[PDB]
């Protein structure tokens, strides 16, 4: 009902249940004036390493500034409607391949792989923003991104960093660690 798929095909069951829960929310709360056209692209669940799981929710790119104003209430509502599950909102952005000479409009740089990954990283952590990135190369040659988070508003996201690393490994495929340093504030 509320969920819009970009392709004309059958939606799955988990995203259908999430859409039913959020439409029952906007019918049975004070958000029906602010969730009229606000649709959901898709949803997916993963297996976070440990003893829990998480839900990834896809959102169309004009609908980010609207959901960022009501991000705080929706995560609380999906927490109280589920059992013990943390939920994150991630935009769906398209990645175009590199225009090699073996293969037409010029590819915009917002659709490049690094720009998509940086946008996914900054949109995953909404209540705490990026105040510094560090990249460490271990002895086997692989990278290790270390992300610094701001000191203000840390009482909600001090325990969600493991789910953040899990979803960043699942969607992108790069190692990431989250820290709260003491330099500026």
């Amino acid at each position: 009902a509320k969920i819009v798929k970009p392709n004309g095909e059958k939606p799955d069951e988990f995203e259908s249940g999430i859409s039913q829960a959020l439409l029952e929310l906007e019918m049975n709360s004070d958000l029906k004036a602010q969730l009229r056209e606000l649709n959901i692209t898709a949803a997916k669940e993963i297996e976070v390493g440990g003893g829990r799981k998480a839900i990834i929710i896809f959102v169309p790119v004009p609908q980010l500034k609207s959901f960022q104003k009501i991000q705080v209430r929706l995560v609380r509502e999906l927490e109280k409607k589920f059992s013990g599950k943390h939920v994150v909102f991630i935009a769906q952005r398209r990645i175009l391949p590199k225009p090699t000479r073996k293969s037409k409009q010029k590819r915009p740089r917002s659709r490049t792989l690094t720009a998509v990954h940086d946008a996914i990283l900054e949109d995953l952590v909404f209540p705490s923003e990026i105040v510094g990135k560090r990249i460490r190369v271990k002895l086997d040659g692989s990278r290790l991104i270390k992300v610094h988070l701001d000191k203000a508003q840390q009482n909600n996201v001090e325990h969600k960093v493991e789910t953040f690393s899990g979803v960043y490994k699942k969607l992108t495929g790069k190692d990431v660690n989250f820290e709260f340093p003491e330099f500026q504030l």
């Binding site: 990249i135 460490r136 271990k138």
Partner: protein, 129 residues
Amino acid sequence: VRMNVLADALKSINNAEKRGKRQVLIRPCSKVIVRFLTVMMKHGYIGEFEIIDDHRAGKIVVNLTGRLNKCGVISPRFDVQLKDLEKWQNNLLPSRQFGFIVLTTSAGIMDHEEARRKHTGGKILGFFF
């Protein structure tokens, strides 16, 4: 003005290695500098290098160790072939036991030994021993 960032990076590494320092700060970053340091660090001449990410141009801080003798560049990028590599490692390297020439290759940034047993060559970057 600034014309070659890899040259200044290797000169800074050489100067701080001669001074006995333990860490450096390369001011501009690039892909070729990261690949060149990756070749050194895979071959066991330096430690882990951290890339300080910002929105203009990154800075690289490598954990230096007492394991390096010299790092240098060959400007401009002279193209070499398989028949021209022997002269370069003859007049550029101390011995035929160690030391490497890193050269730009269509297979990637890679040293002269795998350039030899991959049967491919290209433009030269520099040397270290």
